């Protein structure tokens, strides 16, 4: 069909517009929540800007830009995704720290310590992407995916397991525990407003990052598909993961009594 490639660029345009709006508004006022939504927006814009090469690849199943560009573009996309997830986890833990234990953390509330925490998140995300870049013998023609002269089953197992257990699953556990018990401690007018935000954040993150990882892991084990229906499912799964990147600025940088009143 012709609409599946188009919605990739449509998602890119929408995400870029929203994220550049958020980044323009944030920088012209300033606190630490601003300095963390800055990192989130930077990761989001880089993650969206990395996509369109794959968008044009998926249409004609052909990719004319040279393997040395693909071997860095894929690792940049991976580092952007991991940095975004880690920034989300760090922001959740920072909210928990600021609300529940306000005073004892004044040493860690400084601008410098937040900067080193962000740098630590960036470098930790970077460390996991070097194996992807250094081992992927990018195909010199067509889809420039990952390849290894060594048996590919072991490589797939280790890569998927250390991307899923630590990259996705552990942040989900941390965020869910953090955002859940904070409501319990409060408990009603304040609590009711908090419950909706926590629920929507957790549900959006889970429903945007679970299906992609689960189809990826189910594919590796046994189910190697060939039908075009599975191809369409994969394509719709990918844009589902990109939907969280699209919707994060609206759900964080817009729906907040501080931000919309501040813009006025």
């Amino acid at each position: 069909a012709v609409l599946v490639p188009v919605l990739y660029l449509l998602v890119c345009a929408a995400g870029l517009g929203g994220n550049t709006l958020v980044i323009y508004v944030v920088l012209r006022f300033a606190t630490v929540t601003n300095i963390y939504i800055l990192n989130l927006a930077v990761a989001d814009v880089l993650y969206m800007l990395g996509l369109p090469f794959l968008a044009t690849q998926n249409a004609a199943s052909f990719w004319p830009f040279g393997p040395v560009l693909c071997r860095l573009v894929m690792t940049l996309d991976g580092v952007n995704q991991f940095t975004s997830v880690f920034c989300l986890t760090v922001m959740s833990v920072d909210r928990y720290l600021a609300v529940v234990h306000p005073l004892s953390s004044a040493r860690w509330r400084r601008p410098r310590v937040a900067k080193l925490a962000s740098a630590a998140a960036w470098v930790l995300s970077l460390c996991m992407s070097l194996p992807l870049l250094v081992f992927a013998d990018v195909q010199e023609g067509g889809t420039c995916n990952a390849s290894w002269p060594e048996p590919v089953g072991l490589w797939g197992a280790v890569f998927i397991i250390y991307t899923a257990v630590l990259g996705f699953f552990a942040p989900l556990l941390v965020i869910c525990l953090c955002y859940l018990l904070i409501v319990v401690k409060v408990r009603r007018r304040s609590e009711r407003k908090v419950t909706r935000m926590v629920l929507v954040v957790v549900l959006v993150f889970a429903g945007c990052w679970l299906p992609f990882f689960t189809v990826n892991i189910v594919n590796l084990a046994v189910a190697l598909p060939q039908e075009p229906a599975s191809a369409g499912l994969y394509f719709f799964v990918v844009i589902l993961s990109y939907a969280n990147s699209c919707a994060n600025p609206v759900l964080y940088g817009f729906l907040s009594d501080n931000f919309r009143q501040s813009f006025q």
């Binding site: 794959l54 690849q57 998926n58 199943s61 195909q139 889809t143 995916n145 990952a146 390849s147 797939g156 998927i160 990826n216 594919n219 190697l224 598909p225 191809a231 994969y234 990918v238």
Partner: peptide
């Protein structure tokens, strides 16, 4: 012949 993200 299928991997992460796109085909291979």
């Amino acid at each position: 012949n299928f991997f992460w993200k796109t085909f291979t």
